[PDB]
Amino acid sequence: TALQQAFDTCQNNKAAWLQRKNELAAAEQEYLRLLSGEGRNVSRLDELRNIIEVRKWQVNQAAGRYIRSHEAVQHISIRDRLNDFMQQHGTALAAALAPELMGYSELTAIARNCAIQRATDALREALLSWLAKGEKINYSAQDSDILTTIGFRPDVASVDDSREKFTPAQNMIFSRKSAQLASRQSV
Amino acid sequence: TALQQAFDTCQNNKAAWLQRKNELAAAEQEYLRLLSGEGRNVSRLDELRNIIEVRKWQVNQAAGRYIRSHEAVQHISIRDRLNDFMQQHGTALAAALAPELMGYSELTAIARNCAIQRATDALREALLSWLAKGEKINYSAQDSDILTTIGFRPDVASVDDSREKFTPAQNMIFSRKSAQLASRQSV
């Protein structure tokens, strides 16, 4: 059920990110409408600037969380598909890559990890040969639906909103401002 | 036919290493027998010591060449078995690994490498799992006899005799010594 929980967590993260962008855009458009108005309302303009910038920070945080969740679910799907395919064809890969992986026993696990490296370079060569052959690759039909829903990569809007970085001090003052925003809107 | 060529190269290299080591053993035995005798043979002792040194250098070079040939033939066997198994199960590999390798041909070199590293380390955890549960490993059916002949690892007499790390100047002066010794034994 790990795949299902990863998938629906990614789904609700996507929904939350869309909602964050929705009221960010709404706040921006009504703020520029207020700017176009004849009313001075200097305090109104300042606190709208505060609202829109904290909403931008919240949108960035939501986009980062969604990107992390998408990466996590993609990694989990890769792990499960590689694992059950590996169980399906363990003997084939074993026979193919044995001359360095034979006789694992224990060997202090220090000669064996460098042997694993000396086998994974060969696996990298295998993938290079496959990819130079250049056939068409499709998703695994066992769990292709969830991967198609989440897509190959996060949307361009997410990465565009996650370009800039924030210092820890900025992060915690932003969290405090978000908490005060929630407190004031609750009342 | 490259695998057979590598196998016969390894065979003749190890035969040359064996003949070098037995010649060195005979030379050292003759030197110690002469030393045990009462004959002065000061110049004879010096030239026998020179023969011992050049035979030791030749044994080291032969052991290094045999180790290199064994590594080369093992790598060739890895490549051949890998190619056969991968032509067998390319579709299965693609289905298992797809969620992280789509559209590589249009990706730039940076994206190329970043995708290759993720493929390699995903295969890394896959191999760690296989090696963790760890069943009994055997040779590939097609090339079992060659692996039996060459062995999983080179003999300890090869590895312990290649730990001198002679400098290049030592290498070429010893080559000159071997050349002049061959010239004078021919006469």
Author numbering:
A (entry chain h), B (entry chain g): 4 to 190
Which sentences did the original study use to describe this structure?
Phage satellite P4 polarity suppression protein, Psu, a building block of the viral capsid, inhibits hexameric transcription termination factor, ρ, by presently unknown mechanisms. ATPase, nucleotide binding and nucleic acid binding studies revealed that Psu hinders ρ ring closure and traps nucleotides in their binding pockets on ρ.
Irrespective of the bound nucleotide, all assemblies contain two open ρ rings, denominated ρ(A) and ρ(B), that are laterally bridged by multiple Psu dimers, with the ρ CTDs facing inwards and the ρ NTDs facing outwards. In complex II, two hexameric ρ rings are bridged by five Psu dimers that connect ρ(A) subunit 6 with ρ(B) subunit 2, ρ(A) subunit 5 with ρ(B) subunit 3, etc. Complex IIexpanded is a complex II constellation, in which both ρ rings are augmented to the octamer level by incorporation of two additional peripheral ρ subunits, providing binding sites for two additional Psu dimers. We further refined complex II (ATP; global resolution 3.8 Å), complex IIexpanded (ATP; global resolution 3.6 Å), complex III (ATPγS; global resolution 3.65 Å), and complex IIIexpanded (ATPγS; global resolution 4.25 Å). While clearly defined in low-pass-filtered maps (6 Å resolution), density for these peripheral subunits is weak and fragmented in the cryoEM reconstructions refined to full resolution, suggesting that they are more flexibly connected or bound sub-stoichiometrically. Irrespectively, a long natural rut site RNA would have to access the SBS via the lateral opening in the ρ rings. This lateral opening is physically obstructed in some of the observed ρ-Psu complexes (ρ-ATP/ATPγS-Psu complexes IIexpanded and IIIexpanded). ATP or ATPγS are bound similarly between all neighboring ρ CTDs in the ρ-ATP/ATPγS-Psu or ρP167L-ATPγS-Psu assemblies.
